Structures are given as structure tokens and as C-alpha cells.
Write a protein that binds this ligand. Structure first.
Ligand SMILES: Cc1cc(S(=O)(=O)Nc2ccsc2C(N)=O)c(Cl)cc1Cl
Length: 133
């Protein structure tokens, strides 16, 4: 029941500072432009210990399945090949991605009727807000 409040289908409703976050990550111009336009759906489900997060957009479709605390390989929407570990910290899903000696952290939390996603790369944060579809 660890992630019950995350389960469901979510639609992006607002974004702040995502272009700057993507720049800090190293995303190139054309990908930033096309990824920045998208309004992805995020579909979260749980089966036993396995959590699945799928993102459906006009830009890319991504999917990760994972067990908390257990490192996995991820191909990001911008085509980075990263090593990811996701844990629960005080009710927040904390997702760390490592690649090329770099690191970024994505936090997902429930706040009121929203699912709030905070992406941090060094000093730069982006906030992406989702509501139930
Ligand atoms: C490039 C990028 C995308 C995402 S994303 O919010 O998950 N957005 C997403 C997921 C599938 S398609 C799609 C999109 N914008 O088209 C994140 Cl968190 C971090 C980075 Cl660097």
C-alpha cells in the first residue's frame, strides 16, 4: 500500500523552469524545444513490490518498472542511459539518476489533489504539477 496515493493516471497541468533544468542536465536545443511543448500523461501502478511509471506524450513514451532501493537501468526521454535508484523518504518518491559522472534527483509527492514533481540538477529546480486525468 506504499504508494497507494500515487497510483492512477495523471496529466501535466503546469511547469516552471523546465527549460533551465534541461539545460543544466545537458539536453540539446531541439530536444528541449519539443520536450518543453509536451503535456505528458504519467500512469503509475503497483503490482506487489514492483512500481511502474509510464509517461505517454507526443514527444516520447517512456516506462520504468522498479523495486524501491534496487538500482536499475533507465533510458530517459532525452535519450540518456542512466543508472537509477528510487526510494520512499517520508512519503516522497526520491529518484536519483547517475550518468557520465553526473547526478540528478527527481522527487514525486502528493500535495492536495496534485502530484508535484521536482527535478533538481545542481542549483536548478523545475516544478511540474500533475492532476488526475
Ligand atoms: C526530457 C525530460 C523529460 C522529463 S518528463 O517530465 O518525465 N517528460 C516526459 C516523459 C515522457 S515524454 C516526456 C515529454 N516531455 O515529452 C523529465 Cl522528468 C526530465 C527530462 Cl530531462
Amino acid at each position: 500500500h506504499m504508494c497507494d496515493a500515487f497510483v492512477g493516471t495523471w496529466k501535466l497541468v503546469s511547469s516552471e523552469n523546465f527549460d533551465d533544468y534541461m539545460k543544466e542536465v545537458g539536453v540539446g536545443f531541439a530536444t528541449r524545444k519539443v520536450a518543453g511543448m509536451a503535456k505528458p500523461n504519467m500512469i503509475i501502478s503497483v503490482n506487489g513490490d514492483v512500481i511502474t511509471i509510464k509517461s505517454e506524450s507526443t514527444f516520447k513514451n517512456t516506462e520504468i518498472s522498479f523495486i524501491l532501493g534496487q538500482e536499475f537501468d533507465e533510458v530517459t526521454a532525452d535519450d540518456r542511459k542512466v543508472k537509477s535508484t528510487i526510494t520512499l523518504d517520508g512519503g516522497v518518491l526520491v529518484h536519483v539518476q547517475k550518468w557520465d559522472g553526473k547526478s540528478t534527483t527527481i522527487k514525486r509527492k502528493r500535495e492536495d489533489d496534485k502530484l508535484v514533481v521536482e527535478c533538481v540538477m545542481k542549483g536548478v529546480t523545475s516544478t511540474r504539477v500533475y492532476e488526475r486525468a
